[PDB]
Structure 1
Amino acid sequence: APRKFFVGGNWKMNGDKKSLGELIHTLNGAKLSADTEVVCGAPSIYLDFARQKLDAKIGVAAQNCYKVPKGAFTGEISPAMIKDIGAAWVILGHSERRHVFGESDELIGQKVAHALAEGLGVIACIGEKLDEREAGITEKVVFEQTKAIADNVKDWSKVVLAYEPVWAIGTGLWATPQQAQEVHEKLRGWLKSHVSDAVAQSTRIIYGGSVTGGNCKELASQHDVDGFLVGGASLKPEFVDIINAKH
């Protein structure tokens, strides 16, 4: 009935076999809450390794994919390949893909539709830049990005939405609990009016942007924040504390 708390780790472009191996050993050995759904997003080269080594109870996500199953796209991977190695999730629309690599809402929407058709879960990311926030246009931006995704989702049961203020990613500035709650409750109301009440009540909306062991309890306690997408701290032992933020 209540939405299951969800914590994702995004390792970004970090790790080697030795260091990722150590991190995974730690996670497997920790006491993690029975009521948190945990997913680790590994570099593509280490997806197979990560799935082999991680406790099955912990999910594995790719950090990107492309929009068709196969073909002449040098350097890309498809949902079919991700499923083949046993990963169950993909992260789409991350700030770094949008703003460093130039991925448009239209591309991201096609990626979302293809991932879902192939049976993967999607962590779909949205968020505003500082200049947008300061111009009063957070709601407009966040709703535009969300519509582009929603228009391409036919089954909401394997979607998680991640709200990541761009100014909060990797900077140490985090949104206040009140800043996060405002956006998350507005996103939920958007889902209610534009999709359905059932989808609004069931869909996890998670916060990302400088989540650490020090701030996770306060953020987690907000009524419409259902978890986190964690970058820098997901490579450290305090990731365990974040997974257990509700306890």
Structure 2
Amino acid sequence: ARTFFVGGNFKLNGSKQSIKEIVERLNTASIPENVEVVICPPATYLDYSVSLVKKPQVTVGAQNAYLKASGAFTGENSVDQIKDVGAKWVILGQSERRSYFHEDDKFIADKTKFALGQGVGVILCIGETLEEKKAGKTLDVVERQLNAVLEEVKDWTNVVVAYEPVWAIGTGLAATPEDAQDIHASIRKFLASKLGDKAASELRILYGGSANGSNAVTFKDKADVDGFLVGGASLKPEFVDIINSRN
């Protein structure tokens, strides 16, 4: 049906030694032939991380890039440059970009149609902050985020959606598998009625936010929870345990 995807966002972490030891353990882990693993390092180690990977199921992605591949856009990342180096994914739209780094939904929307225009796969994130949660505004916000992408992008084959309760981001208190299933399935029938039942049925919807070694098995029999976006334990050994969580 859909393939189980485990994305590992490293974040502003990782040195050449630590990238050596993480992608060394992934080449040594015993994972299913039938699993999709994307490690997303800081751009300063993407080229290195692709030198190091020797397991076919693990491709490498960047964590942010800009919506034009060349020019005077100092400080920025480019899809063409990460692609040259051999990476196949870019995370667009993290709780650590939109809040702090002032990324407006249209900014992510336009960014997401140029990336797919360029061959790369996108990891798109959507998420409500605890007050939007306190006021029963979760779906109302997620649809608002998705709809800006939706007004721009119409083939979402190489798109994955990453739902991140902002209040579960690397706090240690995740959603329960049950709470997460409801919203995932809600996002999918919203995305059925906006894209088709076939495309809504192919799209992967990753849960993100305090996902870790021991709680991944509780999300084991959750149909609309197609994988995981692992931030904090992406740089821990229990990362293979979240990749073998349905194994």
Task: Establish whether TM, by shorter chain, passes 0.5.
Answer: yes
Alpha carbons 2:154, 2:195 under 8 Å: kept: no
Alpha carbons 1:220, 1:226 under 8 Å: kept: no
Q: 1:133 and 1:80 mapped to 2: Cα distance?
A: 37
Question: Judging changes above 3 Å, is the alpha-carbon distance between structure 1 residues 214 and 56 closer, same or farther for their aligned structure 2 residues?
Answer: closer
Q: 1:112 and 1:56 mapped to 2: Cα distance?
A: 28
Could you say which residue in structure 2 is the equivalent of 1:32? 31
Alpha carbons 2:39, 2:60 under 8 Å: kept: yes
Structure 1: which 4+ aligned runs deviate by more than 6 Å? none
Q: How many aligned positions are there? A: 246
Segments of structure 2 that go 5 or more residues without pairing to the other structure are none
Alignment-mate amino acid for residue 184 of structure 1: H
Deviation of 1:117 after TM superposition, in Å, equals 0.1
Could you say which residue in structure 2 is the equivalent of 1:4? 3
- Structure 1 counterpart SS, 2:207: strand
Could you say which residue in structure 1 is the equivalent of 2:47? 48
Could you say which residue in structure 2 is the equivalent of 1:162? 162
Q: 1:56 and 1:34 mapped to 2: Cα distance?
A: 10
Could you say which residue in structure 2 is the equivalent of 1:246? 246
Q: 1:220 and 1:115 mapped to 2: Cα distance?
A: 31
Identity within the alignment, %: 53
Q: 1:153 and 1:160 mapped to 2: Cα distance?
A: 13
1:172-222 CA-to-partner distances (Å, cap 9, x unmatched) read 110011110011000110111011011111000010000011110111321
- Residues 1:72 and 2:72 aligned together: yes
Which segment is superposed worse, 235-244 or 145-154?
Answer: 145-154
Segments of structure 1 that go 5 or more residues without pairing to the other structure are none
Could you say which residue in structure 2 is the equivalent of 1:147? 147
Q: 1:50 and 1:196 mapped to 2: Cα distance?
A: 37
1:58-117 CA-to-partner distances (Å, cap 9, x unmatched) read 111100000111011111011111111110000000111011111110100011011000
Could you say which residue in structure 1 is the equivalent of 2:205? 205
Alignment-mate amino acid for residue 50 of structure 2: R
- Note the 1:131-142 alignment, pairs <5 A: 131-142=131-142
Q: 1:105 and 1:96 mapped to 2: Cα distance?
A: 14
Could you say which residue in structure 2 is the equivalent of 1:14? 13
Q: 1:155 and 1:56 mapped to 2: Cα distance?
A: 29
Deviation of 1:150 after TM superposition, in Å, equals 2.2
- Structure 2 counterpart SS, 1:157: coil
- Structure 1 counterpart SS, 2:152: coil
Could you say which residue in structure 1 is the equivalent of 2:183? 183
- Structure 2 counterpart SS, 1:156: coil
1:3-52 CA-to-partner distances (Å, cap 9, x unmatched) read 00110000001011011101111111110111211000011010000011
Could you say which residue in structure 2 is the equivalent of 1:216? 216
Q: 1:166 and 1:82 mapped to 2: Cα distance?
A: 27
Deviation of 1:56 after TM superposition, in Å, equals 5.1
Alpha carbons 1:61, 1:91 under 8 Å: kept: yes
Q: 2:217 and 2:148 mapped to 1: Cα distance?
A: 31
- Residues 1:171 and 2:141 aligned together: no
Alignment-mate amino acid for residue 93 of structure 1: G
Could you say which residue in structure 1 is the equivalent of 2:236? 236
Q: 2:141 and 2:192 mapped to 1: Cα distance?
A: 18
Could you say which residue in structure 2 is the equivalent of 1:60? 60
Q: 1:141 and 1:19 mapped to 2: Cα distance?
A: 37
C-alpha RMSD over aligned residues:
0.9
Alpha carbons 1:127, 1:165 under 8 Å: kept: yes
TM-score, reference length from structure 1: 0.98
Which segment is superposed worse, 230-239 or 218-227?
Answer: 218-227
